[PDB]
Amino acid sequence: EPHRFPPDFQWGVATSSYQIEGAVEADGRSPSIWDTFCARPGAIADGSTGAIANDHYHRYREDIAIMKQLGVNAYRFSIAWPRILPDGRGRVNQAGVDFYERLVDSLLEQGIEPYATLYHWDMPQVQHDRTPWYDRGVVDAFVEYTDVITRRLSDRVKYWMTLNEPWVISFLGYGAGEHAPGLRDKELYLRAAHHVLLAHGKAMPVIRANGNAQTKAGIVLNLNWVNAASDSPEDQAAARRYDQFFNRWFAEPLYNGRYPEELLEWYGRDLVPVQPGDFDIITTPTDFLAVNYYARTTVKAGSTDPMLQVDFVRPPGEYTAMDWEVYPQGLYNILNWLHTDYAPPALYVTENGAAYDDQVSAAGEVDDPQRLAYLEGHFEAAYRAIQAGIPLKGYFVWSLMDNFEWGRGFEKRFGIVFVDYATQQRIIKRSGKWFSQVTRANGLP
Numbered sequence: 001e002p003h004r005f006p007p008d009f010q011w012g013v014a015t016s017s018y019q020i021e022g023a024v025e026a027d028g029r030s031p032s033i034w035d036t037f038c039a040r041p042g043a044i045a046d047g048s049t050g051a052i053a054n055d056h057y058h059r060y061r062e063d064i065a066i067m068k069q070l071g072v073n074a075y076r077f078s079i080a081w082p083r084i085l086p087d088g089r090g091r092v093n094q095a096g097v098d099f100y101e102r103l104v105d106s107l108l109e110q111g112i113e114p115y116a117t118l119y120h121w122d123m124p125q126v127q128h129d130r131t132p133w134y135d136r137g138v139v140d141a142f143v144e145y146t147d148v149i150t151r152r153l154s155d156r157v158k159y160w161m162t163l164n165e166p167w168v169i170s171f172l173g174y175g176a177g178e179h180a181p182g183l184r185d186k187e188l189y190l191r192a193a194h195h196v197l198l199a200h201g202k203a204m205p206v207i208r209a210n211g212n213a214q215t216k217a218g219i220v221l222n223l224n225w226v227n228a229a230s231d232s233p234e235d236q237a238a239a240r241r242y243d244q245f246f247n248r249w250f251a252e253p254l255y256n257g258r259y260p261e262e263l264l265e266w267y268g269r270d271l272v273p274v275q276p277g278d279f280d281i282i283t284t285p286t287d288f289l290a291v292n293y294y295a296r297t298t299v300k301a302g303s304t305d306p307m308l309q310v311d312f313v314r315p316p317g318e319y320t321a322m323d324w325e326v327y328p329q330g331l332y333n334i335l336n337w338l339h340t341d342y343a344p345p346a347l348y349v350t351e352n353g354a355a356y357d358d359q360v361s362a363a364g365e366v367d368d369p370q371r372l373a374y375l376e377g378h379f380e381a382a383y384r385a386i387q388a389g390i391p392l393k394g395y396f397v398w399s400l401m402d403n404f405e406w407g408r409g410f411e412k413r414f415g416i417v418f419v420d421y422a423t424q425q426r427i428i429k430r431s432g433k434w435f436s437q438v439t440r441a442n443g444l445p
């Protein structure tokens, strides 16, 4: 049925700075909101921190040799704000810029296109003390950081992403208390949600000004396929509300200068601190939309989430170790929705992958058939998306290697490369050896 991807398709792997880098005190780095959040009891399921992680700081060169073995033509990573501006603003930490210059230099000389995420959830603690995401001052703080780092790197970085997953930043950070800084307040979530969009909009012309005519920028949304548990009229209303909350809350502002009206009303329209010209800033034209896709969420009328009055149903099917339903059709559905409704000139899958229990065999191999089947089904959905005329330009697997899985710690392994945390040994997994032939064939056997 299906083989070959377009000739210039970007095959990638993805990481974030706090998840892989470690060396949290090295070279003038100040603590991030995650360094502080990991101290909180019950915050990390395994009681771990990102202090060491994969030691990608002291070890990037070896990790790039592994990407060459995987045959990626693209690597997606984040830049740690805590290393660039340790005081949050003002004094540039030259050693911090240096690391990202060495990283980008070593990537380009191995022919790997760098895709840089500016914010992947690791705001300096000291800056959070002045401007939490719910404080409108955060916008100019982020623009300043954007300005400093885009001035140093845009000679060599063409592809820039503003913020990773506004929903996670605002709801998990400020609404559910599950992510740094660990606050639980409807108003704080809605304000943080708005300042993430504004921070995205205000950064766009700074990225373009500090670049060339080749510079491309956009935001990264997490989007999952949402499913009504039944056709009961109040189960379909529950699903519609969770869809608005999860998928439409950022996409509608970015393309149509509006929040989803009925959920805005349900919340209390006043809680969102919209000022004049905010939607003009939020709608600033992007070169692409980056999508982070993992699962189908099936919703019923209920009160688990008391804010949304919904319960979650697990339909019969396959579940990852995160307890996420495997649903490749979902990826095709999300990409087609975005295509038909927002017509972005380019789409990237900047994240997709799965956590399964990995073991090193006596032979020293990691046999992950369930991860391999996850990836195969989703690459298949992406291939169908391209055949339907959807302008998908690349696909980045989450993740290059096992890393700090935020509130799950190291117990959840998303790598196509295994990490023995005892020694920092990388073992390419079966899923990784298969990916290595997918990249070289530029499609599926």
Ligand SMILES: OC[C@H]1O[C@H](O[C@H]2[C@H](O)[C@@H](O)[C@@H](O)O[C@@H]2CO)[C@H](O)[C@@H](O)[C@@H]1O
Pocket (backbone or CB within 6 Å): 165, 168, 176, 178, 222, 223, 224, 292, 294, 322, 407, 408
């Ligand atoms: O760790 C479990 C975590 O899962 C969900 O959060 C996901 C979300 O579905 C994704 O779209 C993704 O980008 O990021 C999240 C981080 O894992 C749950 O909603 C969340 O409460 C839960 O902690």
Ligand SMILES: OC[C@H]1O[C@H](O)[C@H](O)[C@@H](O)[C@@H]1O
Pocket (backbone or CB within 6 Å): 016, 019, 164, 165, 222, 292, 351, 398, 405, 406, 414
């Ligand atoms: O929580 C699973 C994934 O969610 C998000 O998409 C993050 O960018 C990634 O760091 C994490 O692994």
